[PDB]
Amino acid sequence: CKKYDVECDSGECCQKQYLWYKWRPLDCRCLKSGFFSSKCVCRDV
Amino acid sequence: IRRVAISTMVQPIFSYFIMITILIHCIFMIMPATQTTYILELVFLSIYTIEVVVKVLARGFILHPFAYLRDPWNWLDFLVTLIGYITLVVYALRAFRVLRSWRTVTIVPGWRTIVDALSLSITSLKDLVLLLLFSLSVFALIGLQLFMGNLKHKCVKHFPADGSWGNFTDERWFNYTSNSSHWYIPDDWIEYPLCGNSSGAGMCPPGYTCLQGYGGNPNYGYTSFDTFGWAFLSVFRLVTLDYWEDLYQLALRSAGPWHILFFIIVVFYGTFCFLNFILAVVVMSYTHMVKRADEEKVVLSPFFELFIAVIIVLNITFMALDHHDMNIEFERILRTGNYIFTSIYIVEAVLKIIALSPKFYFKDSWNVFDFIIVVFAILELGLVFRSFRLLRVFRLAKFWPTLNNFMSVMTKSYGAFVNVMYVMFLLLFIFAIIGMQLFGMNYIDNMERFPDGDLPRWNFTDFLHSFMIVFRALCGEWIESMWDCMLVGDWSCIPFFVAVFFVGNLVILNLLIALLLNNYGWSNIRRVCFLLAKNKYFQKFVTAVLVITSVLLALEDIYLPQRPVLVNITLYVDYVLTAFFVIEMIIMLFAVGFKKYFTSKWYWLDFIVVVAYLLNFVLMCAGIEALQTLRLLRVFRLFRPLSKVNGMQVVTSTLVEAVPHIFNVILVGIFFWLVFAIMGVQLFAGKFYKCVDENSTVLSHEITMDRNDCLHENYTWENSPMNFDHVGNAYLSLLQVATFKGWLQIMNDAIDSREVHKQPIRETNIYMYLYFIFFIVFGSFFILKLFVCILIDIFRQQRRKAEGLSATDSRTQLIYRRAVMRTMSAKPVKRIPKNKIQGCIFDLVTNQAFDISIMVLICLNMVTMMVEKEGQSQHMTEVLYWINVVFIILFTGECVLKLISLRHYYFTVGWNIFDFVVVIISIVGMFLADLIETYSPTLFRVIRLARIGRILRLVKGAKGIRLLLLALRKALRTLFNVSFLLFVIMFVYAVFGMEFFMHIRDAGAIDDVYNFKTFGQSIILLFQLATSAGWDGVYFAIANEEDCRAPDHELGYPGNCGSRALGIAYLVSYLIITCLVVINMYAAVILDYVLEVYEDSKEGLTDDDYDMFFEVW
Ligand SMILES: CN(C)[C@H]1CCCC[C@@H]1Nc1ccc(S(=O)(=O)NC(=O)c2cc(Cl)c(OCC3CCCC3)cc2F)c(F)c1
Ligand SMILES: CC(C)CCC[C@@H](C)[C@H]1CC[C@H]2[C@@H]3CC=C4C[C@@H](OC(=O)CCC(=O)O)CC[C@]4(C)[C@H]3CC[C@]12C
Ligand SMILES: *[C@@H]1O[C@H](CO)[C@@H](O)[C@H](O)[C@H]1NC(C)=O
Ligand SMILES: *[C@@H]1O[C@H](CO)[C@@H](O)[C@H](O)[C@H]1NC(C)=O
Ligand SMILES: *[C@@H]1O[C@H](CO)[C@@H](O)[C@H](O)[C@H]1NC(C)=O
């Protein structure tokens, strides 16, 4: 598994991460990265 | 010599050489000055002197009829050359050299029409200027009388009884009260809150007393009614609707809610009437110029077309579905769909090119557009070219008839539009250069005067900011920039900004509106029931019942539960009204029958009300609390009686015939705003987040570079309330931008925006302003100004039909008919003088010298009124009172002499009657002024307004002012009907907003004084919102859904949370119905009548012509 803010495709995201002092769940979202372009990264729900 | 000068002067090469030199000079004025710029100014001055020498040796100086200085163009050029040499020999003067750039207007073809229209409008505005000065002066005097020092009211802490400040003495109390540290102010506020002891005004916290005459006025002391100059500035600001909600709220918080009446008058008379006169003058000027200009003089089968149309619509929908923070499945779908769409487009292009021979295929414009799209798509998937994807949306124009016709109209008359836009941008460039030169250094030299010593976001530091500030003023916001300019500058800021407002807003934008207008324009029972239905008394009774119950419905405020009697009255009225509605529906069903009852829209409305009330009654019988929204539907019965008012038929007919066009324009605007909103989403999605601390303050990028650093320091990663995260948010933010309300914050977040998950930096992305500018041109100056044009056309037609005129008659025939009808009614009259002494008085009175002397006396009395100010000694007040006594005595002498001279003939003339009434009022005032003031100050101040009566005589004798006032008087009934419709709409929205947002917690524009708790406060808010002023704050308050506690039905707590969806529906519907439809009606009405008057005084006969004829006869 890989950490927060890393490329992922919805099936390889860790359940939770101890990032910024709380156990935060992680889901692989996909965030704006240009015009009609987006980078898919693992971030907390 | 002379031969050479003539031969060289008229060659086009010389003209184009000079024009290129001027354009280069403009480009160099944009950039900062250096040594290179100095030498290049010398070069440019040399070129201009060569030009001037050539021209003068060609023609002469002034002597000849066609000398050098006989043309204003040469006057401008020669004056600017003189000024350039003066600046070289010996700073503020060197800005105006930019005026040379005006010559560039001649490059664009078709410029003569626009220049002539502009010049005609300016020359025609003279009489309007006189009337504007008079009306603004009258309103400034009224405001000075009403709000003198009211904006200095402050909450002062009581003198402490603990004795820390010491044993009380009058000096000690004054010393404590004057200290600024004892005035109430909430933390982080920059201005002291206003207070007032009148009912409904701002209250002070416990231990605080509302005092007057301490501290400074709001906004660095620039917003007050303390002097006639300041009152004049405030009145002009209120007339222009520039940030007027702030002054409106300050005045009502210091004085009391009833003073709303004042703002109603100035807004109605100043905004809905005069600015419409300016618009009418501009429309006539442009129409005259255009009239003169005109006088001078498989793959090729419908199924495939439908398939590609639906594919295009699907592609537009998927492009709109893009947004921030998506999941992987969604974007995989979207990208796959984009690939499929590109594949379909390639197949379309190849099948067309093969089926239809290549030579003919590229001939069609739409085919080449399609091929351009295909090339851009193949490049995009080859490899930012993804912006060009937006072009696909315009493909829908081929298939949408209305949009196609809109685009065809725009393409038909592009020349005039480009000329107007070029003139607008050239004027903006000239004003930006002048402001950059005049106010450039002051913002830097005197930064300390600013609230934090920090440069404000809008300034004149560089060319880009100067252009932005001037463009903002042209949009309509000039008072705040003027405040900052005065803070760092001097008086010169006032004429500048104000000038920018006239030229840009009231002349150029009105001219663009004028272009838009020119181009886009069992037997027993049934018998008894029919008899009872047609009966007049029964209908009046029903209307009275409806109106009484509707008015009662406005008493249901936040205090209703504390009035048990009112609750009982409400409940019993609900039951009686249910019975009444059932009986009335039964009577109407016996009268007209089922078929005609259920095919009428009004009877649908009545039936819906009946169903809602029966539902509520069965709920109350079942023990369920009544739905309030359902029982608020009875107000909707007020519209049928409202439509039956005398003269109201024209307004409602106009509105019902304008609904289809308004809907079509709304659809087209939705399309264009969809394009702009997709672009905004792609530009600013996810980039409005920022790091904030416990206090809602943004942090420096030095301390928090991004979200990781933000959260490591236990901070908040907060999103801006208005953003472009998806298409709906982009719609709402673009609505804020186009209406010019809340746009400042949106552009600030927009230009501080950086990559996602990064801290915004002040003005790191300045050029993003461009994005908004374009939108404001194509979404506000064009799409939002079509409603008024549609209304103008339809109201013109409707008034023609209302008056019985045939649709086929031409304007000259109508003017001839109006002249003939005027000639039908006319009679002479003669007076007889005395007896010798009385005859001598008669001869004295009739003489025009007497009228001019009275004219002068009235002017002097008006000036004496202007001299009054706050803080003047009691001696000065006594002296002014005695001067006014002298003037009253003189006017009373006038009345005595005229009565003696004219005997009973004095009262034949209406203005004589006005003078008589005014004189009697002034005499009674001399009797009662001593008594009234001694026995509330407000009562004396309000009753002293009758003083204004004897300076209103100044309008008597004017010709153009009389012409405008006659136009206004012919349109008074229609204007009153429009206002009554507006007030009924406001009543409906007030009751519904009282139901919805009566418990929301204080936020934004909503506070203790301004909210929906009572009907009066709701009406105050809705009157403010009917002009679209300050609706961003109201939206923020009523759409808030965070940190709100839900209602507890068991405990009876109603809640304090808002509703974003309900807030959006309420506010957007109100803005569309009032700001874009009903308010614009005013302009429509005005223009028609004004035009009707002007063509009488220009190409026809006017009542003054007959007046002269009968005075002679
Ligand atoms: C000699 N002694 C008569 C003067 C000096 C001593 C104190 C009293 C007086 N001082 C003075 C105060 C104000 C004005 S003023 O110029 O400010 N006011 C007006 O003239 C004016 C005032 C009022 Cl109350 C007014 O009543 C309204 C009418 C409407 C219906 C019935 C009442 C009409 C007026 F014209 C004025 F000249 C005179
Ligand atoms: C027919 C058209 C052309 C004109 C409509 C008339 C308006 C000028 C009227 C209608 C309702 C009136 C409002 C009804 C209720 C109030 C509340 C009133 O203040 C109070 O409630 C005083 C008590 C308190 O504040 O404690 C102040 C006047 C005001 C806003 C009125 C001001 C004048 C209004 C807007
Ligand atoms: C206001 O009160 C504070 C508190 O003692 C004092 O320091 C200050 O000097 C006072 N202001 C003036 C102008 O004296
Ligand atoms: C908010 O401002 C106060 C005073 O300006 C300051 O203590 C801090 O910046 C914020 N408050 C707290 C408790 O941190
Ligand atoms: C976040 O900031 C902390 C503090 O310096 C640093 O140790 C950490 O590596 C950073 N993580 C990321 C993903 O930037």
Side-chain angles (χ1 to χ4, degrees), chain A, chain B residues 1-291 293 295 298-833 837-1113:
Chain A
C1 192
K2 53 192 80 83
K3 300 292 185 52
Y4 174 80
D5 198 75
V6 185
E7 303 157 0
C8 61
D9 291 331
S10 59
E12 39 270 27
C13 186
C14 303
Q15 280 296 354
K16 290 149 165 211
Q17 183 177 1
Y18 182 77
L19 60 84
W20 305 309
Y21 294 163
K22 264 62 61 173
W23 292 97
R24 287 191 177 84
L26 294 174
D27 188 358
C28 196
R29 295 306 302 213
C30 203
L31 278 295
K32 192 50 58 158
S33 86
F35 292 15
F36 297 129
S37 297
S38 287
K39 218 188 156 183
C40 290
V41 285
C42 312
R43 304 161 50 280
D44 58 358
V45 292
Chain B
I1 302 295
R2 186 69 178 275
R3 183 70 57 75
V4 187
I6 297 166
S7 63
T8 316
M9 197 265 267
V10 287
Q11 310 287 5
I13 55 171
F14 183 59
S15 173
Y16 284 150
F17 161 79
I18 293 292
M19 211 45 88
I20 297 314
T21 300
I22 290 160
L23 296 149
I24 301 299
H25 202 175
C26 295
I27 284 173
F28 273 84
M29 283 164 289
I30 284 170
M31 295 296 172
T34 180
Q35 192 69 62
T36 302
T37 53
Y38 161 85
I39 53 160
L40 292 182
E41 306 295 310
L42 266 60
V43 174
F44 287 147
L45 201 55
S46 307
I47 290 175
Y48 302 142
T49 59
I50 291 149
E51 182 212 79
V52 174
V53 169
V54 162
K55 259 168 192 292
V56 168
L57 281 71
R59 303 182 151 249
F61 207 87
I62 62 170
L63 313 175
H64 319 300
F66 302 110
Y68 171 67
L69 294 174
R70 295 287 292 171
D71 181 1
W73 287 114
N74 290 318
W75 262 113
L76 175 77
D77 267 338
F78 184 70
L79 288 172
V80 166
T81 304
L82 294 174
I83 283 175
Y85 274 110
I86 290 294
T87 59
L88 188 137
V89 164
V90 165
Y91 294 94
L93 184 63
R94 64 131 290 161
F96 284 98
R97 68 185 183 75
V98 66
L99 291 168
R100 194 182 267 100
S101 61
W102 187 237
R103 282 214 264 144
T104 61
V105 65
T106 68
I107 75 170
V108 309
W111 66 267
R112 302 215 86 105
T113 300
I114 296 301
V115 166
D116 298 339
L118 212 63
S119 57
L120 172 52
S121 284
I122 301 299
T123 53
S124 306
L125 279 170
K126 302 292 121 175
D127 283 25
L128 265 66
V129 166
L130 286 157
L131 189 56
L132 185 56
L133 271 295
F134 183 70
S135 303
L136 290 173
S137 296
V138 167
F139 292 146
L141 290 154
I142 291 163
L144 181 59
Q145 179 61 10
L146 283 172
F147 302 117
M148 203 168 324
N150 289 17
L151 282 71
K152 268 204 214 295
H153 293 172
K154 281 180 190 71
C155 314
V156 180
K157 214 182 311 173
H158 293 130
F159 192 99
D162 307 355
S164 172
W165 195 270
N167 275 311
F168 163 86
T169 63
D170 189 358
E171 277 162 295
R172 282 285 160 76
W173 183 90
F174 182 76
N175 205 18
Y176 181 89
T177 304
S178 299
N179 200 343
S180 177
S181 66
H182 312 141
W183 305 338
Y184 175 52
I185 202 163
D187 288 330
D188 298 330
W189 286 23
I190 189 67
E191 298 262 35
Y192 293 107
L194 275 46
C195 59
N197 56 353
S198 181
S199 196
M203 303 199 87
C204 311
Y208 280 87
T209 187
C210 192
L211 310 186
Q212 71 204 351
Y214 301 89
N217 278 302
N219 306 127
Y220 315 116
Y222 301 138
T223 301
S224 77
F225 294 79
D226 293 346
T227 71
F228 180 79
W230 289 128
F232 198 97
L233 178 63
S234 288
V235 164
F236 180 65
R237 170 208 183 167
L238 178 57
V239 165
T240 57
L241 294 181
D242 186 3
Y243 193 35
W244 80 277
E245 70 256 41
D246 196 59
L247 175 76
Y248 175 62
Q249 283 165 0
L250 287 162
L252 290 199
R253 185 186 277 278
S254 52
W258 274 107
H259 294 259
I260 189 168
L261 289 172
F262 168 83
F263 288 86
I264 283 161
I265 308 314
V266 176
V267 167
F268 166 80
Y269 183 84
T271 309
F272 303 156
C273 290
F274 292 104
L275 299 176
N276 292 335
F277 298 165
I278 296 164
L279 174 61
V281 167
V282 171
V283 165
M284 293 181 286
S285 301
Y286 181 66
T287 300
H288 174 219
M289 301 295 98
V290 301
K291 289 163 56 46
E295 196 277 331
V298 166
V299 69
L300 320 172
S301 175
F303 295 114
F304 184 80
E305 294 178 353
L306 188 153
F307 170 70
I308 59 173
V310 294
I311 290 289
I312 282 184
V313 170
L314 277 173
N315 189 359
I316 296 162
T317 303
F318 285 20
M319 265 192 300
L321 280 177
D322 207 329
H323 60 88
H324 189 234
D325 203 25
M326 284 187 287
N327 59 61
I328 302 106
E329 62 156 40
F330 212 94
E331 293 181 355
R332 188 180 332 91
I333 292 165
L334 282 182
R335 276 173 316 91
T336 303
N338 170 68
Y339 287 131
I340 295 152
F341 297 140
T342 300
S343 294
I344 288 168
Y345 288 155
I346 279 163
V347 175
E348 186 179 315
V350 164
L351 287 188
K352 262 163 161 43
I353 281 161
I354 298 190
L356 182 59
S357 168
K359 67 182 290 294
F360 288 135
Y361 164 80
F362 288 95
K363 286 288 262 185
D364 176 17
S365 73
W366 280 115
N367 297 11
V368 294
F369 189 66
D370 292 331
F371 199 82
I372 297 169
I373 299 319
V374 165
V375 165
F376 266 122
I378 193 66
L379 291 203
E380 183 178 1
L381 64 90
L383 320 178
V384 71
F385 277 48
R386 321 197 50 168
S387 165
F388 308 122
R389 203 179 283 195
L390 297 185
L391 299 189
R392 312 228 185 102
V393 307
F394 282 107
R395 291 273 311 293
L396 174 144
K398 199 172 162 263
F399 303 84
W400 188 358
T402 61
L403 187 153
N404 187 294
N405 317 318
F406 179 109
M407 192 255 266
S408 71
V409 170
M410 199 52 178
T411 312
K412 277 295 217 165
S413 53
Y414 67 98
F417 290 119
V418 64
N419 294 336
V420 165
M421 289 305 313
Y422 187 79
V423 169
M424 187 205 273
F425 277 116
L426 200 64
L427 290 162
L428 291 167
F429 168 83
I430 289 163
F431 273 115
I433 297 289
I434 291 165
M436 186 180 189
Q437 180 39 32
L438 281 153
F439 322 120
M441 282 316 84
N442 311 73
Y443 279 72
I444 303 302
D445 292 20
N446 315 279
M447 293 182 286
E448 61 78 10
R449 307 197 199 150
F450 284 121
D452 286 332
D454 291 333
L455 194 72
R457 291 297 271 284
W458 302 79
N459 50 70
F460 290 92
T461 53
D462 69 342
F463 166 78
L464 184 47
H465 286 72
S466 281
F467 197 95
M468 295 297 171
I469 195 160
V470 177
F471 173 86
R472 171 176 179 211
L474 184 147
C475 280
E477 294 200 353
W478 58 269
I479 199 77
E480 297 156 279
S481 298
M482 182 164 107
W483 290 344
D484 291 29
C485 192
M486 288 186 294
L487 184 67
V488 298
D490 67 272
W491 61 274
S492 65
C493 299
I494 293 164
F496 171 82
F497 279 106
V498 171
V500 175
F501 181 77
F502 292 103
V503 176
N505 202 52
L506 302 170
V507 182
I508 295 292
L509 292 183
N510 283 335
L511 186 67
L512 188 149
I513 287 165
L515 274 56
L516 287 171
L517 183 62
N518 189 358
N519 293 252
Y520 297 71
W522 172 276
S523 84
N524 184 62
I525 303 150
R526 226 169 165 205
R527 201 179 33 208
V528 174
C529 277
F530 201 79
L531 266 53
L532 194 156
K534 56 162 51 160
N535 188 359
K536 187 210 308 198
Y537 302 151
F538 176 79
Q539 283 148 11
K540 286 177 180 290
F541 163 83
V542 170
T543 298
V545 167
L546 293 163
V547 168
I548 290 156
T549 53
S550 284
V551 165
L552 178 65
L553 190 55
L555 304 190
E556 306 216 351
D557 59 347
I558 192 166
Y559 317 119
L560 180 61
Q562 294 296 109
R563 291 151 182 170
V565 164
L566 195 49
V567 176
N568 305 345
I569 293 161
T570 290
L571 171 66
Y572 283 68
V573 175
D574 282 349
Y575 289 126
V576 170
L577 260 181
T578 305
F580 177 83
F581 290 150
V582 167
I583 292 160
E584 191 201 355
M585 187 188 68
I586 290 161
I587 287 165
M588 301 286 147
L589 287 174
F590 278 95
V592 302
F594 276 91
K595 177 189 321 312
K596 284 302 192 143
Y597 185 101
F598 278 91
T599 61
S600 168
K601 174 262 291 183
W602 293 112
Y603 288 123
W604 291 352
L605 197 82
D606 297 342
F607 188 70
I608 285 158
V609 163
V610 172
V611 171
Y613 261 63
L614 274 159
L615 188 153
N616 265 17
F617 176 81
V618 64
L619 282 163
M620 281 184 216
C621 295
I624 314 188
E625 181 59 28
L627 276 54
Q628 303 308 310
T629 315
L630 293 185
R631 81 182 279 286
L632 286 177
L633 297 188
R634 68 163 177 254
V635 299
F636 276 110
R637 295 279 316 255
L638 296 174
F639 280 98
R640 190 152 204 207
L642 179 72
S643 77
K644 300 169 211 143
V645 170
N646 178 266
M648 183 65 110
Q649 173 264 340
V650 176
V651 183
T652 73
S653 284
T654 308
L655 292 153
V656 300
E657 293 180 352
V659 165
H661 308 91
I662 281 157
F663 174 71
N664 273 287
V665 180
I666 280 171
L667 292 175
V668 171
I670 283 161
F671 171 88
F672 283 96
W673 291 27
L674 184 68
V675 178
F676 267 93
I678 290 158
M679 201 207 300
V681 165
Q682 297 316 309
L683 273 159
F684 308 124
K687 306 163 146 201
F688 280 19
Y689 289 73
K690 64 183 181 293
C691 195
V692 298
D693 57 88
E694 294 174 350
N695 309 341
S696 176
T697 69
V698 188
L699 295 169
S700 179
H701 63 259
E702 300 300 317
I703 63 174
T704 181
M705 183 278 288
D706 59 295
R707 183 175 184 262
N708 176 40
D709 309 306
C710 186
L711 261 53
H712 182 74
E713 322 317 337
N714 294 116
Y715 281 139
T716 305
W717 191 245
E718 180 84 60
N719 188 13
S720 173
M722 281 275 138
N723 48 63
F724 301 78
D725 279 357
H726 52 90
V727 175
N729 278 357
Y731 290 164
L732 196 49
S733 297
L734 288 175
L735 181 74
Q736 297 223 327
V737 172
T739 56
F740 308 115
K741 306 291 177 300
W743 63 274
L744 296 190
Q745 180 48 59
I746 298 174
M747 304 193 247
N748 289 336
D749 272 293
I751 62 161
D752 311 308
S753 57
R754 277 141 48 64
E755 293 82 3
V756 186
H757 293 117
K758 297 275 154 272
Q759 185 59 13
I761 297 169
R762 184 191 220 260
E763 276 159 330
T764 181
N765 204 348
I766 193 73
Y767 285 106
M768 281 315 168
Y769 288 110
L770 282 162
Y771 166 78
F772 294 85
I773 288 158
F774 273 80
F775 176 70
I776 286 155
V777 175
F778 289 92
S780 188
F781 296 172
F782 266 84
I783 297 168
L784 293 182
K785 297 316 211 305
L786 285 163
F787 300 96
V788 67
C789 297
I790 287 153
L791 292 170
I792 284 155
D793 291 331
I794 296 171
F795 177 81
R796 179 202 316 126
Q797 308 143 19
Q798 280 298 316
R799 203 201 143 203
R800 293 201 70 230
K801 314 152 191 143
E803 271 148 21
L805 307 170
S806 178
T808 194
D809 290 6
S810 70
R811 213 74 191 283
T812 72
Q813 323 193 270
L814 287 172
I815 294 160
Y816 176 70
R817 184 179 295 277
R818 272 188 276 141
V820 186
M821 291 336 300
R822 265 190 283 290
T823 298
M824 187 66 204
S825 281
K827 317 174 193 81
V829 65
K830 180 63 179 296
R831 290 161 191 257
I832 294 165
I837 298 94
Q838 218 169 12
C840 183
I841 307 192
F842 184 110
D843 282 12
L844 181 62
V845 160
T846 62
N847 184 359
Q848 297 282 311
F850 187 70
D851 199 73
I852 302 299
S853 195
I854 294 299
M855 190 83 225
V856 175
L857 286 176
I858 289 160
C859 275
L860 292 201
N861 189 359
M862 181 145 188
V863 161
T864 300
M865 269 164 209
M866 295 156 183
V867 174
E868 199 278 331
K869 70 179 76 172
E870 183 178 1
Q872 68 194 20
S873 62
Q874 289 175 334
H875 163 277
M876 177 75 160
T877 316
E878 287 312 270
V879 170
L880 288 172
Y881 292 149
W882 282 111
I883 297 169
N884 272 282
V885 161
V886 176
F887 277 112
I888 280 168
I889 288 177
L890 271 193
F891 297 140
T892 295
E894 181 181 78
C895 165
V896 184
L897 293 191
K898 289 174 74 176
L899 282 153
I900 294 157
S901 293
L902 312 173
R903 313 185 279 225
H904 85 86
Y905 299 104
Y906 174 96
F907 293 101
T908 65
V909 176
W911 270 98
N912 279 10
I913 297 169
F914 181 85
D915 296 348
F916 194 61
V917 170
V918 159
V919 163
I920 300 309
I921 288 173
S922 300
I923 297 169
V924 172
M926 294 306 98
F927 271 48
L928 265 68
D930 189 358
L931 310 184
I932 291 161
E933 186 173 358
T934 67
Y935 311 116
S936 175
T938 300
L939 187 63
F940 173 83
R941 283 159 93 157
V942 180
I943 179 64
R944 194 161 101 101
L945 278 182
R947 196 166 67 125
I948 306 285
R950 59 185 182 267
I951 63 169
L952 292 177
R953 292 179 60 208
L954 180 42
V955 298
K956 189 201 57 65
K959 303 292 292 193
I961 293 172
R962 200 69 202 141
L963 191 152
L964 286 187
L965 293 192
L966 174 74
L968 188 70
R969 204 181 31 251
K970 287 177 231 200
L972 200 51
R973 204 151 291 101
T974 309
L975 295 162
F976 163 75
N977 279 338
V978 167
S979 307
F980 194 43
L981 177 66
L982 178 64
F983 165 64
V984 168
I985 289 153
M986 283 182 60
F987 177 91
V988 170
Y989 271 83
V991 293
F992 272 101
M994 273 188 98
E995 195 59 279
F996 300 154
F997 321 118
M998 182 178 72
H999 298 111
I1000 62 172
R1001 65 151 195 73
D1002 280 9
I1006 297 294
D1007 59 59
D1008 59 319
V1009 176
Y1010 300 102
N1011 49 60
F1012 295 91
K1013 291 184 199 341
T1014 60
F1015 177 77
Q1017 298 184 51
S1018 301
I1019 284 284
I1020 294 170
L1021 274 181
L1022 286 165
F1023 178 70
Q1024 176 191 301
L1025 291 160
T1027 67
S1028 87
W1031 79 265
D1032 54 295
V1034 171
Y1035 171 77
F1036 179 77
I1038 71 183
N1040 183 22
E1041 312 211 78
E1042 321 315 329
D1043 312 336
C1044 64
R1045 52 191 273 250
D1048 294 349
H1049 298 256
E1050 63 187 342
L1051 291 174
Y1053 176 69
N1056 65 0
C1057 205
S1059 171
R1060 186 216 183 192
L1062 200 62
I1064 289 161
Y1066 185 86
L1067 280 175
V1068 171
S1069 56
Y1070 192 68
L1071 286 168
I1072 288 160
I1073 298 174
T1074 57
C1075 306
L1076 297 174
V1077 174
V1078 174
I1079 293 286
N1080 288 341
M1081 286 291 306
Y1082 289 113
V1085 179
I1086 294 296
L1087 280 71
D1088 207 42
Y1089 279 86
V1090 166
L1091 264 65
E1092 191 196 40
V1093 170
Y1094 267 73
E1095 60 188 355
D1096 288 317
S1097 68
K1098 270 166 142 195
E1099 309 268 30
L1101 287 191
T1102 299
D1103 50 11
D1104 289 345
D1105 306 343
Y1106 296 109
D1107 291 331
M1108 152 178 186
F1109 187 74
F1110 271 78
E1111 182 66 27
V1112 163
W1113 159 275

